[model samples]
Target chain A: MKKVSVIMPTFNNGEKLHRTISSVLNQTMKSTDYELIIIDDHSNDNGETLNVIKKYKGLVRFKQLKKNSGNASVPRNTGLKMSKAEYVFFLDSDDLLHERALEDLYNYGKENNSDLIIGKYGVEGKGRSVPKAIFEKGNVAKADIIDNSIFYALSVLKMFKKSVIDKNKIKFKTFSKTAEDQLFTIEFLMNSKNYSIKTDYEYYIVVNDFSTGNQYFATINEIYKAIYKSPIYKNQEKRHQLAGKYTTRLLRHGQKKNFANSKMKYEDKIEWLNNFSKTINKVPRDSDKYVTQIFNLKLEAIRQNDLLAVMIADKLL
Target chain B: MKKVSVIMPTFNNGEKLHRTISSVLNQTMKSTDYELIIIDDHSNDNGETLNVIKKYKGLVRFKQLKKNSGNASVPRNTGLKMSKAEYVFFLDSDDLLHERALEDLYNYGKENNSDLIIGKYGVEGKSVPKAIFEKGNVAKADIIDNSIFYALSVLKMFKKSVIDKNKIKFKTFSKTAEDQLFTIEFLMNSKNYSIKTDYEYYIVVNTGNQYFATINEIYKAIYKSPIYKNQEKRHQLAGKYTTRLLRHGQKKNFANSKMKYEDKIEWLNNFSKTINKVPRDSDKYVTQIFNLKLEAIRQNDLLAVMIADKLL
Candidate 1:
């Protein structure tokens, strides 16, 4: 049985899929120590893409799904169930891995007994890269996160223990189009009884399409509902807070200089203001004066529909 | 012909309706001064309800909807279109009015030739009261005195000419729920407006149904399509604020320590993910708040939403 299962899910990206598959095949680990599983998301348009992967017959096992499950979750989940390794890595079809990515990640996981190992990705091109870079030389997880840049890649560099992932049954929901990767990775990291984060060693590449994504199509409310209701963030308070903040930022972005409606226009600022004020008012009555001042400023925003008040309150020291 | 029309959309409470109707029928002004229109929202149990108003067959007119429209806006809007009177009052079915609600309202409008009249409600039971109560009577209202308070007490009489001429109509979307947006803008833009706001000259009534009262069944009506993105600033801000308040308020009413259990788990999860994202370069409080919110989320404080979103 392989010590690490590098699960790669591919679709129509024939050109990039070939390079990514070869990168994994070229991992420095002995062939017996690591196994690679690729599940295609039933894409007929990527026939040339399918042919490119066919060239690697003895190199890696491939499962071309008959039906395309459009989102990566379908193929990734399939690969997860099929893998026999203690640790796993989820790589996207169009993304390529650094030559020694799996070997470096696996060693880190084995030595530290870390359930997860996160790596870094550099955006050397035009598209928006979907990886966070944390500054750490070795196995720098949460402990290494300091006053410096706090970045951690989601799926590419991480090596997850199958037992922790499966035992928790923390699988990504299949329908989530945009944040399925994020949803899966965050939950596994958050809920994993044992996990670690590493930096600078391994790398993966995301070729941003420079286009609106699947999840981007959701209405503002729909996106909010999906994000908040996702199983990963299910009943999670931090998620709710983050969701509120995320939405507030979005709302701010869409607000007009004059009181014209945005795509996600508020019904009435006073009502929203009041709602926010009530939250601020809940700061412990006996707490520090600063908390009171922050709370009071939020109250002012609630009283007045002035967005400036909220912007000011948010900056309150 | 009546100078004003008073439209009250009623429901299951025959007793409250009787009281409310009595207050309107026995107005101190000449009864002929205004017309009364009572719309029953197809209350199955109140079939005999209309019999109580038989004495004023000519003075009052009755209309019964085949179905309950949930909110009073549907009925009020319907009745306003039907009324020939020059002004209208969209009162609730159960709320009582000060005897002078119509008389004082009309005189104020006539004297100022105002398009709309905005007034306060006197909740304590007082008879033959004024159109608006003294400021002290509305301690809660005073907390938000700066607001147009446009939607409450739908009984604020409006000049038909002003509303019709300006094409100001209550949006039937909220059905019985959201008529305030229209009322607020109507008054704010009134060419000629009269305002009698006193704890004494009040539009006497009890508080209407709050959002939670009927939310479990009709929540979709309030939440689903309220257009939060383009929703009026006051409404949008109110919603965001209300959500926080309700989250906090409901925390206490969690039946047990339901909140405590959920809160700690959230804090742990948030801190684990976010403490790393706090910018070392910013003010210490930014980092501190990130930590504090993580702690608060763990502690079950919903207020952490302000700080928690920053954590990557």
Candidate 2:
């Protein structure tokens, strides 16, 4: 029985796919303990792409979608259904997995009996890196969303318990690629019995992707709906901090650090903000105690539909 | 003055978009005679798509949608509102216009005073009938016939006033069949609609990923519309519409795609009422394949209906 199932959704990423697949295959963890699943999202590369994977044979599992979904979420959703391991990890076709990524997360994840675990990660792209606080801090045995900075980094570069995911019947959002990773990861964390962020060593390596494949994401609809529906919303403060953690980022370019400096017109910005604010207006203000002053200002600016205030709060020129 | 406004809604079609746009520009018609209103659907492409179109600048008009509507309806409607020409033509990003397409349709449209014009069109990947199978300027094509029922695409040229006055617009809720709904509604109000089947005017590229459930929704809406009420007005007209309509869903045609067995059974159950509305007039004209399907529906054999529609 494999301990981890690596689900990688491949699009038209070209030759980079083979190298990314090779990184997981050469992981320090025994190949027997992990299975690599490559679900092709109907690449137009045809023979050039399919030829590279033919050599893997029994070393890997593969399937191509009947149609191109134009996004990675569709194949990831398919991989989730095909996976057999107790824990599953998601890797991008263009991103590499650390040699020790599976073993380190597997050892810590099982030893700590975690429902979800975010391992230390490194970025190879120019001027791109993940959140710093959790990685700089020491190992966390039990990370809470209310207390930890885990809510900000919802990318699927973490180890997930398969049972928790399956039991909850959680699936990736389709049609729109907006924060599908964030949506799935947030739900996994919410449904988890225990979550952790272990900074012992670098575990996952992400090659910077500048593609606009993730250019726009309004996962507020995804997050707000799930948070409201989940049994965990009973706690006002916990729900508040989680919603507040993502509210600012979700309203702006998702996962992008920009606040109000997008090229949207004055009229368009108001339309976009006013539309998104309808969902944000549902979140409670109980987390003002935990949130920073700037966060609250940004939230208020969005709610007020004050574009000038939004730009000023972000210190954008 | 620009005689026609080509409302092209573009997503991230990359270079193909440029080529499709090029096809319109390269048309034998004078550049000043038609306007290309390209409304972007918030493309997510990393490549600089806007960089290529700068050469055309004022010759064309461009507007980026505030957000991705995830469907073509919003952008088409946006173009409708932005349009200034007396006639409007709807073309997709990946589809190309026939070389003399604009000139052919524009000249004929003006001469006949057409409200809508269904020019001769050919599909790229598959063979589906492009209705108005006959040629020449059809001043008043039979709406109650199979030829008109199959003219579901927006590949034709339409009068802006016909849509403007009737407030005829695409349905926002669906990704497919909204074209059909818009045409049906336009047909309801279209008095001067005409057809020109002689010229090869529009080249349609097949980008197939339509869900069976979505197709059934369109089928149900079209079946339930007031259009069919007029079909029953005459027995011969009713038979032609029924034959073509049955060939769409009830026949085991590979080109039309298959509805899931479960969905097919349920749809037949729900659509049983609509099916019953079409009189026994169709039975005399249908083929042997059609005979098998009608028997299955009559016997209430949902399993047989699924097989007849799917397996042949």
Candidate 3:
């Protein structure tokens, strides 16, 4: 039985697909031990991209979703249906993998007998120095990650045991435009206790080119929805709510900073602040004071030209 | 020496300042050990605000800035400068405090000697909370909070040494808006120790009745020059970018969402798609994005269409 299954959701990035395909087939793991499942969402140009993956017809399985599923969520869900491995890894088409990435990760999990394992990757041209996906492959038994907001990236580096995925009924929601992996892994991470990690290999490449992929940078609308739908809002726990409050304040602080200085006319300025305030003001009245306290703190720095401090504070905020 | 000092900044919230003053003055902590510093940026109707604050004169000290300043940063900075307490807890003039809020915090800080102590707060009502703030006080902490973003609300109880040593103060440029920006930086750079009890030390009061605040453009323009101007802006402040919002909304098919306003909801979506496709060889979206400049991007989104007719 194949021990690992890598799910790659593809669209029209034919130019880059070949490089991605080459990296997967060159995996150090024995061919029989694992399977590569590629789900091609209907694309406009299928020339070279399809041909490259097609050549490995016998080695790997390739399936195409009949109609275009504009978002990658639908395609990813389709891949989930077809995957049969005890463990699964997800990758966007434009991202890549180091040849030994899988070998290092799979070994760490099997040896440790872990249900979930996280690895590290590098940003493109950063020489595979991307941030680690989960607690760097070690003893996290005493690690209380919940107190801290979220710190791991779900961009295909972590390997998940399929049983946990099925048992927890983990699934990514189409609600988020970007950062979908976080929602999926968060569910798994929240439920599992025996998680593992590996600091050995560079698992995946985080492609920063905004030219092609659906890399939605943060925005006001998303902020609004996140305010309403974020796991933070649903979280009744004190720490989670605090984390959520932290994120919400920063979001509004950002809006305040961004809107206050833009060259928009004085009239537009009030509108923007008012709109943002409407949401912020909605924060329960009692919470609003704390929110205001934090907001005022930010407002002061923004006024002081302490941009460096502001940037540094954002991560910790 | 008191374990914590509560910092409150005020402008013209005269009518409401009395309640805010009483909450802190009535704290369970001894008035001598802890100091309450209130900075009043020049106000037109200072009579009522000061009259009430006068009753608690020894308990809390109120300082008035020379001019309107048109910003809250100056007054807050002035207040911080005047304070000699070991810890500073910021309060807003329009908000009230839970009577024993500081006493509980003082006890927690004294017992643990925490660098930064934070507790839960109730929102909007009379100390009755609407949302709760938690950080593994009662339950297990799962993630590494150091890198995790959090709220810098009134719930935070800070040690004065950290601020003094770090020379950290509200940005002041933002005036009334510095709390979050400062909280963002302070929480990250300083140590954050949390107590998970839902003690209502802070209260949120609605201030939307003012007519001018209803306008949108006034705040929308804060995006570039004021928001992203700092080299280290991202590190200190946490937020969603317009581009991220636009692209993600498009990807998620935001139009179909139940709650979002259709017209303005998709504006970001439309803007990102159009700007991304515009030629970027010389000075298009690429230049704007690469340089982190928004004027050009904004031009592409709304202004470009306006000038297209004239250029032709």
Candidate 4:
């Protein structure tokens, strides 16, 4: 079996597919040790997607679902089912797979007998960049759910054990249109026995580019519910702290310039800001000075449905 | 015109009908201020049910839905449509109202201008209740603030305008969370709902029969309803009926049969298999014994069910 199977779920964004796939192919991990499987989400990009995919024919394995699922869950799950590797990584077609991304994670996981391990994520997009908490920590072998700010990184940049997922029967929630990544990661995180975090290697890069995904932001409330109701984290103190960090990150995501300029419906943004404020108020205020002030500004702005205050808060942070 | 309208849907139970109806008439609110509309689902309790309904004659309006609906839904709808009051209260035939139940809720509804109001429910000797009542009388609130989803019963008071405007009607299913669906649809389309915990407003008197039908009948309604899916909590009570139905599987058809215990076992086994997909959150509402029995049922444990039957 391959050491790692990279599952890249794609849509109509063939524009950047070349660099994204190239990053995976250029991995320091032996080409034979890892394989890239691209699951096209029934892209209707006038063959631009397939034509780009065909260029690296033998270097990667790929297929297109007959019908579009309108989300990444189906495509990701299809590739997951097809993976022949011991460890699986979910990659967005537009995101980059850094050199040594797979090899570093796989080697560390094997040496530590880890069921899960998150490599450093390099974030860049447009002109603004969101902070990734763990990446600044260097390498913390004793990674934990709360202390590591694990819940804040909801993206699928980490390596997951196939056995844990299979054992827990963890599958993406089809009931929702967004936040499936957060939900699935939490499920996988909770079921994992030994997990670690390595910032020694920058394995994945997420570009916070403009997308209309912000319109459905309220849907991520599922993440809040899933974490709160989750069977683990028995200690209420850690639970509250963990929830606080998650909520803070959630509000930060909303404050991003990408969301501000995403053309999200006026009423939809109002609803999301209101819900975000609601989430912030419910969690403990164990936030840093910057986070606390940001939360306060967000709540105040949402109270009046003032979009200007939010745009200012986006720049304030 | 009255302040509150009471909708009581009955099948064949009459022994307790007098007490149930008296609870309404005995309310502190003047008998004239509230009207009880008793819709009979074509009960053949050999005249017992109709006779009891008739004795109340001048005080209550009675109607027999031409065909038996095998559930409370059809009859509830009939009374709901026929209701004339600003608010409606649905009461089961066997359940009685506590003293001042209607008066308190109706007055509270008017004072708060509440679109919906849920009262404290007291289970007959068992205190079987929705956890919602544990929160002392809720103030002006929305669904999540009041956790109104937990109280998915017709035992609450509702705004007639909201009910009418939404064109909301109950869907018929064999003794499932049909009340839940009605309450869900009602809550979604209405606002300013509150809870009244000062007085135990409704008394639940347990009486029953098995739904020999599958739980899927009830499951299909919400998934297919025009209700938008957004909050995961909308599914909070989603599992209520399945586990409770499984717990209710303790006998009389469910709690059944002249058809040998083995035949009934397969019947229940069939029911359990279909509900495999339903949420299991309702397990908390049932007893530990039911919890054990529930798992065994899902596991297809034959002797386990046999013992559960014997113990229950």
What are the candidates' individual DockQ scores? 0.01, 0.01, 0.01, 0.01
Candidate 2 residue lDDT tens string, A1-317: 68999999887777667889889999889888899999988878856677777778899999988899987788988999999799999988888777888898888888889988888877887755586666666888788765567766788888999998888998887735566788888787777758888787677777876613222424556676676556745676667766666664453435433434454433555566665556556666564444555576777866676555565455422
What are the per-residue Cα lDDT tens digits for candidate 2 across B104-144? 88788788788888787777885545546654567667765
**lDDT at residue A154 of model 3 (Cα atoms):** 32
Model 4 agreement with the true structure over A1-317: per-residue lDDT tens digits: 99898998888886678999989999888889989999998899899988999998898999889999999989988988898689999887778877888888888899888888888877775653534776676776657876677767766767998888877778876765766778788777756657778777557777766633333444455565555565666565555655656656666564443343234544555566665556444444443332445576654554455554564444445
DockQ of 3: 0.01
True contacts kept of each: 0.00, 0.00, 0.00, 0.00
Model 3 interface RMSD, one decimal: 13.7
What is the docking quality class of candidate 1? Answer: incorrect
In model 1, what is the error at residue B187, expressed in angstroms?
30
Off by over 4 Å in 2: A209-218, A248-262, A315-317, B1-312
User: Across residues A279-315, which tens digit of lDDT does each residue of candidate 1 receive?
Assistant: 3333322222222233455435533544444544555
How many pairs collide in each candidate, listed in order? 47, 0, 116, 5
**DockQ-based class of model 2:** incorrect
Which ranges of candidate 4 are over 4 A from the true structure?
A123-132, A174-178, A206-218, A255-317, B1-312
TM-score on alpha carbons, each prediction: 0.39, 0.48, 0.40, 0.43
TM-score of chain A of 1: 0.67
Off by over 4 Å in 3: A111-113, A126-143, A146-156, A209-238, A241-317, B1-312
* Native-to-model Cα distance after best TM-score fit, residue A121 in candidate 2, in Å: 0.8
Clashing pairs in 4: B250-B255, B251-B254, B251-B255, B252-B255, B253-B256
Residue lDDT tens for model 3, A1-317: 57888888777786677778788889888868778888887776846667667777887778888887677777777777788887888877878888887787788788877777666556775432354424443434223343222333434456888887787676766654655555566556555555555555556767766411123222333333433443423553433343345444354523234544333443454444444444444343333333335455443443343432232233234
Write one digit per residue (lDDT tens) for candidate 3, span B1-312.
Answer: 555567776766766777777777787777676778877666667376666667776667778777777766676678667777767777767777787777777677767666666656557744332223433352222113321233434346777776677676655333233454455445444543655565656667761112112111112222222324553343222222222222222222322334345443345334444334322322221212222223223333333222221222
